[PDB]
């Protein structure tokens, strides 16, 4: 199949073939608005993996996120605290720019529900991500029993809660020795158990 050839060609991003396409498209993407609808997946291959079945109701928005970290919003760099919290410039936002992309695609398209996203280019100033959006109300999705999980009210705004694959990676969850601080539901759920007096009735 062609998809395996597109898969391994997309791993040779330093090649003359892909450095032409990742640059000339990255030009084309700057000239477009910061959030616009793409008519198809830029990568038909990558969208296959992340769940994009090319049928009616499946949507792909190409949104760009302004590149760099996060500087602390304080007037004239003055945090009026202790020398630890004096920091502003070299600070980093907890979620990835791919997750910041999905939650603008999903916020703008509130009617739709965000599945996943994939990188399609980066410049000095911007990254570019195709975000896979689904209609929970198109009968193609609303009838297909293996894709009617998004159609239920539990999956409203996955992108906003870190349920999307890009969103999950900011939380620090997974199994084993490295992911103890989010054992239970999350980092918030771990913290609670550990800082709750189980004052038993008898004790």
């Amino acid at each position: 199949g062609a998809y395996k050839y597109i898969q391994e060609l997309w791993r040779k991003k330093q090649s003359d073939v892909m450095r032409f396409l990742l640059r000339v498209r990255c030009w084309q993407y700057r000239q477009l608005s910061a959030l616009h609808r793409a008519p198809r997946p830029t990568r038909p291959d990558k969208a296959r993996r992340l769940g994009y079945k090319a049928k009616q109701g499946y949507v792909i928005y190409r949104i760009r996120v302004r590149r760099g970290g996060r500087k602390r919003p304080v007037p004239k760099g003055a945090t009026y605290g202790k020398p630890v919290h004096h920091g502003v410039n070299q600070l980093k936002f907890a979620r990835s720019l791919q997750s910041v992309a999905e939650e603008r695609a999903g916020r703008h398209c509130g009617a739709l529900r965000v599945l996943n996203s994939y990188w399609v280019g980066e410049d000095s100033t911007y990254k570019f991500f195709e975000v896979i959006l689904i209609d929970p109300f198109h009968k193609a999705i609303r009838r297909n029993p293996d894709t009617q999980w998004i159609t239920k009210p539990v999956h409203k705004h996955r992108e906003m809660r870190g349920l999307t694959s890009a969103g999950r990676k900011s939380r620090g969850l997974g199994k084993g020795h490295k992911f103890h601080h989010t054992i239970g539901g999350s980092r918030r759920a771990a913290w609670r158990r550990r800082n709750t007096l189980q004052l038993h009735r008898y004790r």
Binding site: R142, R143, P145, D146, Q148, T151, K152, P153
Partner: protein, 122 residues
């Protein structure tokens, strides 16, 4: 005149509207009788005419909507008034049909590996 709802529902479309435009005239005479100063016998009647306007207009408005949701009964697109109001989330649910759709792979698992009624000995 005591006006009930039993004896109005058999009456005609043109019949009810004239009885309404008789009670409106009767109530127009009682509102004057409150202002012209006197007749407590009339003042206590104005409620009986106010509520009998509410009886006739109900029987008018009931037979409107009985006919409408009879008209749109077999029709697939009906007005938002006639569609079933439950909670908003309860309208946004999957159908009685769509919940009961299994995939072909899942129908096979139900078929070949059906859940057995079993018991074990001590």
């Amino acid at each position: 005149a005591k006006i009930k709802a039993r004896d109005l529902r058999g009456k005609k479309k043109e019949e009810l509207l004239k009885q309404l435009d008789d009670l409106k005239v009767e109530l127009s005479q009682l509102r004057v009788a409150k202002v012209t100063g006197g007749a407590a016998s009339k003042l206590s009647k104005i409620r009986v005419v106010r509520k009998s306007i509410a009886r006739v207009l109900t029987v008018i408005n009931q037979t409107q909507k009985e006919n409408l949701r009879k008209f749109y009964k077999g029709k697939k697109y009906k007005p938002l008034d006639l569609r079933p109001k439950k909670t908003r989330a309860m309208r946004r649910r999957l159908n009685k049909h769509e919940e009961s759709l299994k995939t072909k792979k899942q129908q096979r698992k139900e078929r070949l590996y059906p859940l057995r009624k079993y018991a074990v000995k001590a």
